[PDB]
Amino acid sequence: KEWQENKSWNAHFTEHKSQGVVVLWNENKQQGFTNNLKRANQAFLPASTFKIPNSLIALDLGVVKDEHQVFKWDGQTRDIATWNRDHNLITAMKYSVVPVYQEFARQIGEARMSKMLHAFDYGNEDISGNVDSFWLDGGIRISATEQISFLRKLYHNKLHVSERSQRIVKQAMLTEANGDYIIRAKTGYSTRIEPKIGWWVGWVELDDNVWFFAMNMDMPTSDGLGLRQAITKEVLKQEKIIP
Amino acid sequence: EWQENKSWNAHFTEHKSQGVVVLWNENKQQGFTNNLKRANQAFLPASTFKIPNSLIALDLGVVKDEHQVFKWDGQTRDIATWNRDHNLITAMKYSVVPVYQEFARQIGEARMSKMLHAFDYGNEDISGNVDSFWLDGGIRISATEQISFLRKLYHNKLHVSERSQRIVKQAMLTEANGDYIIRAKTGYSTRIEPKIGWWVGWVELDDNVWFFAMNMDMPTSDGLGLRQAITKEVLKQEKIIP
Numbered sequence: 001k002e003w004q005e006n007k008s009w010n011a012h013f014t015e016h017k018s019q020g021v022v023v024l025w026n027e028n029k030q031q032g033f034t035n036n037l038k039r040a041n042q043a044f045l046p047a048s049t050f051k052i053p054n055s056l057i058a059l060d061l062g063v064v065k066d067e068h069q070v071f072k073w074d075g076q077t078r079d080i081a082t083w084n085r086d087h088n089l090i091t092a093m094k095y096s097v098v099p100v101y102q103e104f105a106r107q108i109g110e111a112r113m114s115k116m117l118h119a120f121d122y123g124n125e126d127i128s129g130n131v132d133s134f135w136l137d138g139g140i141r142i143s144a145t146e147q148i149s150f151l152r153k154l155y156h157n158k159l160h161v162s163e164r165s166q167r168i169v170k171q172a173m174l175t176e177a178n179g180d181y182i183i184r185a186k187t188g189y190s191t192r193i194e195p196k197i198g199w200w201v202g203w204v205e206l207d208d209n210v211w212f213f214a215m216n217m218d219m220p221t222s223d224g225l226g227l228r229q230a231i232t233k234e235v236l237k238q239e240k241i242i243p
Numbered sequence: 244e245w246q247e248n249k250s251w252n253a254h255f256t257e258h259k260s261q262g263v264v265v266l267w268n269e270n271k272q273q274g275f276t277n278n279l280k281r282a283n284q285a286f287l288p289a290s291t292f293k294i295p296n297s298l299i300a301l302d303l304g305v306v307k308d309e310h311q312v313f314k315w316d317g318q319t320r321d322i323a324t325w326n327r328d329h330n331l332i333t334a335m336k337y338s339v340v341p342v343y344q345e346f347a348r349q350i351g352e353a354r355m356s357k358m359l360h361a362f363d364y365g366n367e368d369i370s371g372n373v374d375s376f377w378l379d380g381g382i383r384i385s386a387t388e389q390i391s392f393l394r395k396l397y398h399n400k401l402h403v404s405e406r407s408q409r410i411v412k413q414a415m416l417t418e419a420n421g422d423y424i425i426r427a428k429t430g431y432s433t434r435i436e437p438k439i440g441w442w443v444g445w446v447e448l449d450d451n452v453w454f455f456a457m458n459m460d461m462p463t464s465d466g467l468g469l470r471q472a473i474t475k476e477v478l479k480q481e482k483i484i485p
């Protein structure tokens with residue numbers, strides 16, 4: 001009853017030569033839906049979806065003063081062109097600018113990172129590995145259903161950080177908005193440790209409800225990255241959440 | 244600081260319309276408009292007043308937060324979306340006048356005036372009914388004054404809480420995608436001539452913000468869509484949005 005399995009959504013994966021899980025949570029009904037309960041509860045490296053808790057911690061500790069503070073480019077030209085420029089929190093999140101977030105993590109430090117994540121009840125809460133990459137090749141692991149629990153807290157300002165920090169992060173998560181819905185979310189691509197997987201987690205705000213979502217899918221090559229959003233939107237469209 | 248670009252009149256004329264678009268490039272600190280005189284013509288703000296009103300209501304605790312439900316008072320009105328319970332997000336989205344009339348009544352004449360003075364909002368004149376002065380009272384604000392007010396809101400420089408300013412900016416969210424984000428509020432002044440439409444707000448880009456304030460003659464509701472369409476035609480011309 002709390003979590004129901006809806007295997008019809010596999011069609012959206014199969015039709016895109018893909019495999020994964022979409023987890024949906026109807027906030028009003030307090031009911032959850034997924035195509036794969038086992039994978040929905042399978043813990044994976046959060047990769048860039050960790051930018052959500054990382055942003056929160058950095059804002060609450062003053063490592064990030066606000067969403068306008070500029071994080072200068074360190075001069076090192078990296079494979080993703082949008083990272084080779086100055087950023088603020090909005091564009092660092094939009095473009096998933098790793099080096100900015102690595103710098104935040106170093107400033108936050110192992111001790112505060114660890115104990116702040118416990119406050120968030122975040123995945124296995126294990127930050128073992130490099131302080132600037134544990135979310136990518138360290139010990140930390142989070143499931144799609146755990147992403148939803150974490151995101152619901154963020155949504156309701158129930159994390160144990162300031163309302164302000166939560167509001168700023170939810171601003172930074174803004175992905176898409178029109179007269180039908182608003183999506184606040186963060187993508188992720190876990191590439192360093194097998195299985196390579198793509199994430200999209202967040203929620204869709206409607207006029208009278210919110211639908212949280214967490215999906216992940218096998219991502220052996222970057223060519224499928226756009227399917228993280230597309231498959232999710234096919235599920236949302238199937239469920240009449242978005243037109 | 245204000246430069247005229249008459250080529251933008253094409254977007255009014257071609258739509259069998261007349262108005263002004265005012266644009267401010269925040270980075271360059273330069274303003275552009277198709278009609279300098281109309282850019283400075285003060286008009287009734289109509290529903291664009293939902294911006295300061297929300298701000299004031301939030302700061303005074305009249306609105307606890309964006310989730311607080313404003314129960315429908317029971318009166319069924321013409322615009323179908325107003326005949327239901329609302330929160331600040333949807334009240335704003337649909338421009339639900341009754342919810343805002345109720346806010347203005349709770350805020351009260353004295354606190355409203357003080358706030359608008361502190362905001363340096365238009366002529367700062369709340370004369371008329373406490374619950375309709377923005378529609379048929381003395382308050383008048385120009386496109387350029389809207390921009391000045393909106394720039395304050397954007398930088399949290401208004402004298403209300405930072406929180407209030409954040410919540411109102413959230414509530415102003417109109418459209419967002421990988422190219423831009425628009426935070427804005429539409430308006431339609433129907434009760435006092437000249438009947439006009441408004442769209443004021445801004446477009447956030449990655450590395451800049453373009454504030455905009457447009458108003459246009461609106462003798463019939465047929466042209467209400469042009470408030471956005473003309474502005475976007477201007478924004479598209481300037482390569483601000485694709």
Ligand SMILES: *C(=O)N1C[C@H](NOS(=O)(=O)O)CC[C@H]1C(N)=O
Binds near residue numbers: 046047049136187189
């Ligand atoms: C995050 O997972 N990463 C940083 C960046 N994010 O792009 S994503 O948001 O679309 O997932 C590239 C992928 C990954 C990384 N290589 O660190």
Ligand SMILES: *C(=O)N1C[C@H](NOS(=O)(=O)O)CC[C@H]1C(N)=O
Binds near residue numbers: 288337340429433
């Ligand atoms: C606001 O100016 N009004 C309330 C509502 N707003 O819709 S609008 O923002 O698209 O202009 C209808 C028009 C107007 C009114 N009748 O008071």
